[PDB]
Design a binder for this molecule. Sequence first.
Ligand code: HEM
Length: 153
Amino acid sequence: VLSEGEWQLVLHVWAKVEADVAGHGQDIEIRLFKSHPETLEKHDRFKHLKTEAEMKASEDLKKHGVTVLTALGAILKKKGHHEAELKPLAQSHATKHKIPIKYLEFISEAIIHVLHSRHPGDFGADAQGAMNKALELFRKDIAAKYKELGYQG
Ligand code: HEM
């Protein structure tokens, strides 16, 4: 459980993410793939990318980065009450794309890193703690859906 203050901290930083969703999305994907290159293999449309030049030029890479942040945005704005949002996400990512909870932990790390990198003036220990809690809640709830779908996990 996050307090109302923690949720507002999250949403306040998220407003900044949504002020440049394209740049943030590119940054999180590039960071994810550089830190954990095996995750790129899951993306058949752009698993060919190797160089950062290629990554920055990829429309497909940017599109997933933007969709991640936009989806997460809608989820976070529900402040925990995100069952309806998580349902389709767990469905596709468990049964179609086959994305392990481990990879959602990786992309969560990438998000935290990029927030810290782009917003060092606002994103201190308090905001990072709150963002970590919100992402942890998301991961726990999606993991429970993964199990329900038989996807381990
Ligand atoms: C906060 C975490 C994430 C969110 C909110 C998210 C959201 C989405 C959405 C909305 C789509 C399009 C509709 C759909 O298929 O469900 C999609 C597609 C897809 N996703 Fe994610 N995703 C997340 C994490 C990741 C990760 C970590 C992987 C791979 C490591 C990935 C792999 C894919 C693939 C392969 C597709 C299909 C087409 C494409 O490449 O865009 N997802 N995701």
